[PDB]
Amino acid sequence: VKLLLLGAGESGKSTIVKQMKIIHEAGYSEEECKQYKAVVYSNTIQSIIAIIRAMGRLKIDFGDAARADDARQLFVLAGAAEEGFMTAELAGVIKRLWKDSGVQACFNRSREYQLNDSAAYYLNDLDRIAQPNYIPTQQDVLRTRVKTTGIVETHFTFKDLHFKMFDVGGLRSERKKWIHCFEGVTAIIFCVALSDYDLVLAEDEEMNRMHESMKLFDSICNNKWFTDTSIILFLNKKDLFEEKIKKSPLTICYPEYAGSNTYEEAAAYIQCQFEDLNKRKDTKEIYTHFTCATDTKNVQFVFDAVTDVI
Ligand SMILES: Nc1nc2c(ncn2[C@@H]2O[C@H](COP(=O)(O)OP(=O)(O)OP(O)(O)=S)[C@@H](O)[C@H]2O)c(=O)[nH]1
Numbered sequence: 001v002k003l004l005l006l007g008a009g010e011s012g013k014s015t016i017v018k019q020m021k022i023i024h025e026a027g028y029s030e031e032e033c034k035q036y037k038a039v040v041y042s043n044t045i046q047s048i049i050a051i052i053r054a055m056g057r058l059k060i061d062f063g064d065a066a067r068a069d070d071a072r073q074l075f076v077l078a079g080a081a082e083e084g085f086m087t088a089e090l091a092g093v094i095k096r097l098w099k100d101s102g103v104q105a106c107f108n109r110s111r112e113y114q115l116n117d118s119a120a121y122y123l124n125d126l127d128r129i130a131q132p133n134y135i136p137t138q139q140d141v142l143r144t145r146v147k148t149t150g151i152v153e154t155h156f157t158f159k160d161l162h163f164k165m166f167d168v169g170g171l172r173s174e175r176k177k178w179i180h181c182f183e184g185v186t187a188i189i190f191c192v193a194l195s196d197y198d199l200v201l202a203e204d205e206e207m208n209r210m211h212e213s214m215k216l217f218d219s220i221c222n223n224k225w226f227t228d229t230s231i232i233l234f235l236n237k238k239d240l241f242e243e244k245i246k247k248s249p250l251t252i253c254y255p256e257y258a259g260s261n262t263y264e265e266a267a268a269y270i271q272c273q274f275e276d277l278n279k280r281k282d283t284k285e286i287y288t289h290f291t292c293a294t295d296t297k298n299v300q301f302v303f304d305a306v307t308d309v310i
């Protein structure tokens with residue numbers, strides 16, 4: 001069974017691949033967890049730095065003036081983290097910064113810049129991750145963000161079927177590599193980030209993230225090469241969408257949306273926008289699922305349901 005994961009950048013494709021390891025195998029070993037330690041620290045320092053860069057660009061001041069010296073020390077200290085090291089000194093500098101009112105206000109305006117989804121997860125848990133002899137947990141691994149370049153091939157057995165799952169990069173530079181994967185595809189799992197409706201592309205600040213997705217899906221879904229391939233649509237990041245819909249208008253993306261700022265109502269609407277792109281509704285089926293890629297139980301039951309359809 002050959003499965004292919006497609007979608008724009010940061011839509012959740014690689015996190016689903018990790019889930020297969022945890023569910024069909026036995027999770028990451030201690031040696032493998034320790035390999036992600038430097039990425040966790042790397043992901044965390046980059047996020048605090050991104051918020052600080054933005055405060056200058058957005059003209060936002062710190063809440064307490066004493067933070068300016070912590071922001072000085074951060075850069076003096078920053079380089080050890082990359083090497084998988086986090087002193088109780090660097091930890092306090094980051095912590096005091098993350099807690100600053102000015103920093104927080106900037107954190108709350110992240111759609112104006114580029115910030116990792118897992119910034120809060122890590123930054124809100126510094127005590128644990130800066131610990132002496134810290135080893136990344138299964139959730140810490142799933143939360144790491146590393147751009148995919150090239151093609152990754154993963155194998156696993158499930159219900160007597162041997163899967164060969166392919167994963168590629170969704171950023172614009174990597175899309176030219178999707179065609180090498182187009183052969184013998186049993187099923188395509190197209191990942192779409194529900195929470196991307198109010199953000200812009202990292203590759204272009206003038207392009208809305210959700211519209212980009214619509215373009216990709218319309219193209220893949222309606223490709224004649226895929227007539228006999230199963231199209232599974234994962235409306236991912238349902239957990240972030242749920243919190244986002246409450247304070248960010250969906251009219252930023254879909255100006256004609258007349259419904260309310262609610263999850264069930266707003267979710268079905270995005271579902272219909274995507275399923276609407278299917279040009280041969282009577283002869284072509286799309287199997288849609290709302291997901292939280294970082295939630296093992298959620299992915300388990302969804303993947304279980306997906307393979308039954310296969
Ligand atoms: N909270 C939350 N975070 C998620 C979810 N799915 C993925 N993430 C986070 O989004 C980030 C990007 O996911 P990732 O799997 O790297 O995207 P990708 O599609 O593989 O991206 P690319 O390789 O084309 S650049 C990761 O830090 C990951 O933990 C989700 O449903 N909820």
Ligand SMILES: [Mg+2]
Pocket residue numbers: 013014146147148168169
């Ligand atoms: Mg990836």
